[PDB]
Each structure stands twice: as structure tokens, then as C-alpha cells.
């Protein structure tokens, strides 16, 4: 029997596509489907060599490759839409690589997934990764504070938020994940409660803490 | 003053209430042999007496009633 | 044809089933009268059931209550005991009404319990609620949020908006396929 | 021809039954006498309607109510008790004069319940009211918030129109149609 | 033939019989001796049937009354079970009176109840009514709000003109022809 | 087994009209013969297909139709008291389309209903709607805020109504609806505590003085 | 035999769509008709291939694709009233494209959608999308703010609404998500208690809450 | 086949072979009757299947609480006693409510218990909470934190956010394809 006919009845969910090291890869959008598939190939009733991929699997496999042949790279995500031509989201302002060494970056990443016939390099531009990423924070009616360092940006949002403002924002950071990566800018949502809970303080270069009405406490400047 | 002895002596009947349960359930039990004629008085009250401080009464009721009145502890 | 679990009853019976069918494998119920239930796998499909059952910590233990702790039996009933014993009813009625709302499939309510405050001079606190939800998919989530606030705020004394604490989510993909029986 | 319920009551049944029937799958009310009814489907349809029970929660418990933690035939009868057989009972009989309005199809009434306010010194707070309503549809469901605050305002001994919320919504597409025999 | 509901009461096989006719389709009622009654419905309508089961909450509770909460068999009667007991008939009288007036086919009443002025030197407050009737279609229901009010406002000892709250409204279309039987 | 003979014995309160797409619409009135019909065409006991119409939810359908091939339109309501041939209430005075263009929209209202024969478009005035909802709310003598802004109008009756002034606004809302519809002009029937119903003044030094109709309200004591 | 004999009675509520693929479509209208007619093809009484799609989340598929090869594009919504035809609803003040390269991308988005045939692009203002959406929460009489910043707006619901208010704001913003998405103006409907119930206080240029007879509350402004 | 265990519990037996399971040894789970279940393993796999015991510390104890030594069955009850058994109760109730989450397969949750305070004259203390959970991997958990935190903080009096300590993770690989005997 062949494989596609040997998973479920609805043959939407999966493909099936020819390897070429003699195997056959099948894929997966969910890691539920995922272990649907592997259960098939575990169970052992298939003759031939099979294997199940996934988008954020394949994804975290190959940076692993990515980190030690080729460390201090700028690089966003790998999208695999169509799982024969994926694109590879390479940063613009941030790279030293000519022309050549990147028709040798797609040959080499070519022979990591031989499912694939061709890897499309394309450069996106790192301002609006961030662009994006305040916009999108600003019409939540979030409130949100930007950190700007070298090499990727960071957006903290603290203090004692409500059921609807950890909803919204809990929504907005799993779709821009989900585009985008982890790789250049980070979310900090950290629910606690405000600082110096019930004191009364003198903010501003020369501080204190009243611990009480005839107790001072002299910290750090508050 | 006299609502507080209201409010004493309908306390003070449910404490009553076991009691007589004890020296009912005593004096019965020498009717079933062939003790009709003994007095139940001098059995009822070692029955009664070891029962209340074993099960620590008296710092049962000094708590409950002081309870009503203040923050107590 | 091995057996993993026997004696189930009905409710454990039909979410052992419900678990195992939807990570590819068939499982078998079999009836045995005063014994219980029982359930049976085939024989590829035992290595992987075993990692489930282990995983999922299956058979589900029944669900336990505050009312249950203070039975209404008991000849003396202290008020820490009927005051535990009216809270669960009422944690128990309002996740009763919340599943007749539109589109709530499940949900589970929680209040906060004050017992010290009427055995001795002190003033009560104030009153929390926290409450699970589980919605049918295809709904806007984010405004379903206020009619459950403003459903839970006076059923009780003297609530505010900062003591609820709503979280609640869309329910799961569905399974209605076969497993497949595996070929030997 | 697979059994998926048995031991159920009555009015268990006729609920998996609504509910199965509602997602085109068919099923069989089995009578068997003194032990119960019994919901039987076929084998096609036995992978979804395992996940529907376990989604729904079916079968339905029992619907509770506060005043069956305090019964009747107990010895002593605290006023505590007393007022919360009380209160459970106006809540109770006010759900069942809400369904005799002009268009409502069910209703459910939650009293605060504040039972240790009258019994010490401090004066006893205001009282709140909660309901919500499954309207026939077509009506204008926006307009009818103020006939049953206007109800429920003056059955009590001081609310404010503040104290009171409504949730009230339209009811469901109608299921008419037979779900059909699975073809193999 | 296949049945949905046995066992009933005369009054509820009488509501269950007039909300399935409503909707066009047909039920027979068949005695049963001492088991009660039972409805059977035909094989095309038993997927709506079930629909409305559900939905109008059939079969119907018996109504509840607040004197069945605290009975007059007891050996010792609070003043509070004792005031519940005489609001209870007098909320019982009015209602059975309201209905000969001339035009009303149905009516409801509620009086607020106070329990926790006597026991403690708290004074009593106002007492507050609430009413509900169905009026004969044809009639002007806008002016008979006086008549019911000026009748409920001397039956007590102190309300007001606006503590009593009247919702009334007139009744639904007649039901006069037969449902058919369904041809195949 | 005719369509008219398998309704109930009455005939004269449902109306079967023939179709263009060859099918059979039974118009009925309201949502409870709605059910009674839809019955008849569930169980099955008819030879060909047929359709259940209305006038409540033909309006409703039509206008999901009409509010995405014709955004900003302004109009009022579809009267079906002849149902072969309607009468669309186009407002006049908030629209300027031609009448060549106002011939391809009657054409393709009428391509949109199989059952019609051709639409007539009527042009309403828009000082009458306004007008007989304020004169028609001074006669049951209720106290009202009217709140004028562009391209609508809204009614608010705020404050510790009694109960025969809940019952004339409700009988009257009901009753305005039917005929005008709310795309243009809005009730907001709301009971809250306050024996001013709906208005506030401000005292000092000359008097009182009408305040300006907004949200908070101040509580009553009295 | 055919797939629209083994749907329910009502041959109404279903729409069956030929392929170019050789599949077929069921298009349905709702997440109820979506499972009722996933249950046929799942148990499997139909030889061929079929499909069930939807209105959104076939809105939510090829936005998938379309934050891939398209991303920074200002759109709408994809309108399915009438399915071998779809709407796209494309803003004009935020596009930096020719006559070339919109054919070009109805010919990639006919290739997404193989039911289709054509697919129609109109361009709207943003004036008019953020217009009826102040219009039509002044007519409810809500209290709202609104917020405006490049490439999007946003309304702030605030206070302590009632239950009547509640519903009004409910009726509304469902019926504006059904036209025109949440891409471009975005509502915040969050309620909180009152302070200022039973105090007295002073409002205006110095304002103040008397929270007591001797405790004065003065606000951030 | 050599003997390892014997006398075990249905659910002592189906942890001992998901642990043999892991390490590339087999087991049998041969019934005994009315003793118990029984596990052997090859001779081979005898050596590596007693240090993996000795190790792993199996068979499994029952799994303790807190109310199984203050039981409800005594005539008298003290206050230290009801407190912990309400405690305890609840403590089990969060625990259940937390399982029906997006995402997680197992939780557990410790409530900070209270002794000395009722008779102490020292006001009691403020609560602490400590939550594990293990979640579904792929789930991006360190926003998950945030939800347990709001769920957690106001289902009591007065926590606070620095009270509450959530240490969550990702469950382990899994194991689906079969040890394989050994080839003797």
C-alpha cells in the first residue's frame, strides 16, 4: 500500500514528497498531525524508509547546522509554504556577504533538505521588522517600553495588566512569531504588581523610602 | 443587663442537653441487668466528670464565649 | 488483544477512549457487567499506549468538592462547616448557568473562602471569583470577556473588576476520523 | 451497534440524543427496563461521537440547588439554615415567573446571598441580582433589559438599578432536518 | 412510533402535547395505568421533536412555592419560619384573586419578604409588590396598569404608588388547526 | 400532494408565489408560521424543492448583499406588502446617483429576487423621518433628548420611568420600526436612579442653568 | 451517487463549487453547516476528493501566504457573496503599486483559490473606513476616544458601562467586523467601577476627590 | 522469564512498564489471579531491569494529601483539624481546574497551611502558592506563566504577585516503536 493511502481518509492534511536520498519525507503543519504520522511510521506497517517533518522542527534543525558552520549571521526564518522552493529571510543591514557566497549559502543549504529543488534567498529590511512590531504593539492600547541596542530591540511590558490586556497581547506576540521569529526582537510581558507596594516615596536623584511615618529607608536612588 | 441573662441561660441549656443523654444512657444500662434498686447518682458523676476534661472543656467554652465578644488571640 | 486496563467504569472508560483515538490508535471497550469496563489495544499499538497512559495520567480520578469534605450528615455542625458547605453550592450553581450562555461549552468557577472572619470580632474581606471558560471556535474571544464580568460582579456582596480574573480559550480541533487498523 | 452510554435517565438521554443530532450523526434510544435507557451509534460514527462526549461533558449532572445542602429533616436548624432555604427558594420561584414572559424561552436568577450581615451588629447590606435569558429570535433583544430590571427591582427590599444585570441572547438555528444513515 | 417521554403527570403530558402541536407536529398520549403517561411521536419528526425538548426544558418542573421550605409538621416553628408561612398564602390569595378580574387569563405576584427585623431591635421597612398578567387580546392593556395597581396598593399597611411594578402583555395567537400527518 | 394542499386547512394565510430559478417561495408573515411551514419542507413530504421567505429576514439578507456592492448607500427599508412587486425607500437627500444608474440598481435588486417582478424605487424625504419620530414621542407625552449629528439622529430616554411610561415607549418603538427601520434614526431606552429624568442643572448666582447632555448622572436622594 | 443527494433535505444551505484540480467544494456559511458537512466526507460515503470551505477561515488561509510573498500590503477583507467571483477590498492611500503588478497579483491570488475564476480589486479610502466607524459609535451614544497614528486607528471604550451599553457596543462591533475586518481600526472595550459614587468632589482646571471629610484625592492628569 | 515484581495495583503495574519500556527492555504484565498483577522480564534484561528499580525507586507509593490523616469520621473535631481539611480540599480542586487549560498535561499546586495563628495571639499570615505544570511542547512557554499567575492570584483573599512561584516545563520525547526482544 502506499503511504498516502496508509494515513487518515481526508488527504488534505498531509504531503507526500520524494526525496532524493532514496526516502520520503511527509509533511506536517501541526505537532499534532505530526505524531498522527509518526504513529504510522512507528507502528512499522510501511516497507520502505519515511520520515515526518515539520515547520518549527525543521526550523529550530537547521539553525542548529547554521550555528557552527556559519556563526555571526543576521538571519530572520525559514518559510516553507512551498516545501520544494522555501525562502530564507536574510537581513540587508547587517550582513558583509557579496553575490558568490550566497549562491554557495544556497547550495549548502540546498544539501540539508533534499526535499527541496531550490532555497530563495531574499534580503528583508531590518527597520521595518521593528516597525511592524511598535505599530502592532500601539493600536492594542498597550502600554510598552523600548529598549534599542545593536543587534535587536526589546519591548517590555510590565505593571498589573487586565484579563483583556494579557489577551491582546497574548494574540499579537504568537502571530508576529509566527512571521517574523525570535531572532531580532523580543517581547517581555512580565505580570507582577507595582513596585514599592503600599509606601510613600521621594522619587528623583536623591531618594528614600518611608517604611513608616518616623522611618526612613535610603536605597538605591527611586 | 437583661439581655445578657437572656442571652446567658439559652447557652447555658445546650450545654444541658449532653449531659442528660450521659446520665440517661447510665442509668439505663443497670435496668437491663438486675440493678433496679442502686442508685445511679455516685456511677453518673466519675462518667461525667472524666468525660469534660479528657475532651478539655473548660478551655472549650473560656474560647467560645470570650469569641463573641472580642478579637481574642 | 492486551489488556492495559480493566474495572474502568463508564465516564473513565469514555475519556480513555476519547485519548488514545486521537493520537492514531484504536482502542477496544468490552462490557463485563459487575466488573466494569474493560479496554484493549493490539499488540503494535501497546508501546505507545503504555507512553500515553503513563503521559496523560489516565484513568481520570473523580472530581472533588469542597461540600464533600463536610458532609450535612454529621449530628453537630460548626459554622466554618455550613458557611463551606454554602460556598460550594454556590461555586457549584454558577458553572451551572455559565454553560447556558452562547457558544460555552465548559467552565469552572472559583471563589475565595472566608471562614475565620465569623468566629471571632474581625471584619470580613472582601470577596475574589476566577473563572475558566472554553468557547467554540469561529467567535471574537476578546469581547466575550465583559458579559462574563458583568454576569459575575453582583452575584455576590461587593465585588470590583480588579478581583475577576476571566481566562478562557477556543476549544481544540476535531477528530472525526478513523484511526486504521494496523496491517501485519 | 456500539454502545456508548448506559444506566442513563430520561431526561439524560433526550440531551445526547439533542446533542449528537446536531453534528449529522444518528442514534439509538435503547430502553432496557429497571436498569436505564442506553445511546447506541454505528461504527462509522463512533470516533466523532466519543469526542463529543467528551467535549460536551455528556452525560449532564443533576442541576444543583442551595437548598438541598440545609434539608429539611435535620434536628436543629440554625437560622443560617433558614435563611439559606429561604433564599433558595425565592431564586427558584422567580426563574419560574421569568419564563412567562412575552418571548422567553429560559431564564436563571442568582441572589447575593449574605447570611452572617444580618446576624451581626453591623447594619445588613444591599442586595444583588443577576439574570440571564434565551429569547425566540426575531425579537429586539435590546429593549427587553428594562422590563425585567423593572420585574426583578421591586421583589426585594432595597435594590438599585445599579445592582442589577441582565445577559440575555437570541437562541440557535433550528435543527430540522433528519442527519441520514451512513452509505458504505 | 418511537417514544420520547413516559412516565409524566397528567398536567405536564398537557404541556408537552400543546408546545409540540404548536410547532406542527403531532403526539399521541397513551396511558400507561399506574406508570402514567407517555408521548409517542412519528419517525420524520422525531429529529424536531428532540429540538424542542431541549429547548422549551420539557418536561416541566412542578411549581415551586416558598411555605413547602419550612412545613407546619414541624415541633418547633422560628418566627421566622412562621412569617415566611404567612407571606407564602397571602402571596398565594392574590394571585388566585387577581385572575377574576375582568380580563386577565393568568397573573403572578411577588411580595418582598422580611426576616431579620424581628429577632434584632432593627425596625421593619416598606414592603415591595410586583405583578404579571396575561391579558385577553383585543383590550386596551395601557390603561388597566391603574386598576391592578389601585388594587395592590390597599391590601397592605405601607407601599407607594411607585414600589409596586406591574409588567403585563396581552396573549399569543390561537392554535385552532390540526398539525397533518406526515405523508411519505 | 400540492404545495398549497400540504399547509393547514386555512388558506388564506400563507401565499405561494412561482420563481424564475424554477422553485416554489412560500412567503409567510411572521417567525411562528415561519416554523410551521419550514416543517412541512423538513419532513420531507414533497416531491420537488420550494423556499420559505419573509419579510423581516429578506430585509436581513438583502442587506448583506447590498453593503459590500453598494457601500455608503442610504436607504430605509424593503416593503413587501405586494410581494411580486416591492418598494425599495431610497433616501434623497444623501445621495446623488442618476437615474440610469438608479435603473441598473432596481435591475439588479430585481436579479437578486426570483420571485419579484420588478422593483419600484421610491425617494423618501429625510425631514419626515426625524419628524414624526419626535411627533410621535411628544403625543405619548415622554421625556426625550434629541442628539442631531451627520446622517442620523438618536432618541434618548433615560431615568426611574414608571410602568406605564415603559409600556407607551416600548408600544411605540415596535410601532416606528415597522415602517422606518433603524438605519437612520435611534431609540436608547435605558432605566437608571434618578427622579430628573434625564436632565441636570447647575446653581449659582443667577439661577440655574441647563447643563450639557452627557453620561454621568448624578444619584437621587430622595 | 452525487454529493448534493448525500447532504441533508434542504438543498439550500449548501453550495457545491467544481474544481480545476479535479476536486470538488462545499462551500457553507457557518461553523455549524462547516461540521455538519465535515461529518460526510470524514465517514467517508463519497468515492472522490471533496473539500468544506468557509468565509473565515478561508479569510485566514490565504493570509498566510499573503504575510509571505506580499508582506507591508495595506488590504481588507476578501469578500465571498458570491463565490466564483471574490471582492478584495484594497486600500488606495497606502499602496505603492502600478496597473502591472496588481494583475499580477490577481493572477497569483486566482492560483490560491481553484474555485475561482476571476478575482476583482477595488481600492477604498481610509477616510470613509474610519468615518463609519466614528458614525456609527456616536449614534449609540457610547462614550469612546479615539486614537490616531499611521496605519491604523483605535477606539477606547471606557468607564462604568451599564448592561444596556454593554449590548450596544456587542451589536455593533459585530457588525463592523463582518464588512471590514480588524486590519486597519481596532475597538478597546474595557469597563471599571466608579469612584466618584457616593463623594463629592470638584471637577474642571482644579480638579479634586473628597474621599473623606479630611482626605483629598488629587488625579494624575 | 525471571520474576521481578508481584502483588501490585493496576496502576502500580502500568508505571513499571512505561519505565522498562524506556531503556530497550521488555516486560509481560502476567495476571495472577486474585494477588495481583506481575511483571517479568528475559533473562538477558534480568540485570538491567533490577538496578533500573533500584533506581527509579519503584514500585510507586499511593500518592499522599493532607486530609487522609484528620478524617471526617471522629466525633469531635478540632478547628486545627477542619482547616486543613478545607484546605486540602481546595489545594485538589485548583488542581483539577489547572488540567483544563490550553496546553498542559499535568499540574500540581501546594497552598501555605495554617497552625499556630488560631490560637496564637498573632493574626494569621498571608497565603503563598506554588504551581508546577507540564505543557504540550511547541508551546512557547514563558508567556504561559502570565495566565497561571492571573488564574492564581485572585481565587484567594489577598496574594500577591511575588507570592506565587510557577515552575513549568515541556514534557519529554516521545516513545512510540517497540524494545525488540532480545536475540538468544
Redo the contacts between chains.
Sequence with gaps: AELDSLLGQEKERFQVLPGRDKMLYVAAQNERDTLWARQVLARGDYDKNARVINENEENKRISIWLDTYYPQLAYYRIHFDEPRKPVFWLSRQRNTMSKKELEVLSQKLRALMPYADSVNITLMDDVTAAGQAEAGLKQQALPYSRRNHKGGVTFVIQGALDDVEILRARQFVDSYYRTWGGRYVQFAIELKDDWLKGRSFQYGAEGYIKMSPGHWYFPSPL | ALSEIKSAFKIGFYLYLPFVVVDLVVSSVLLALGMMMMSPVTISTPIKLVLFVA?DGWTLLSKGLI?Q????? | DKDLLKGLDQEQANEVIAVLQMHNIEANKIDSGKLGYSITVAEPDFTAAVYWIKTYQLPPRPRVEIAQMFPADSLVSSPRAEKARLYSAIEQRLEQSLQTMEGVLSARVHISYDIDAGENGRPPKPVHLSALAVYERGSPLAHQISDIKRFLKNSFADVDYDNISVVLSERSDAQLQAPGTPVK
Tied chains: 1, 6.
Excluded: N, P, Q
Design positions: 475532651l469569641l465578644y472580642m478579637d481574642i488571640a
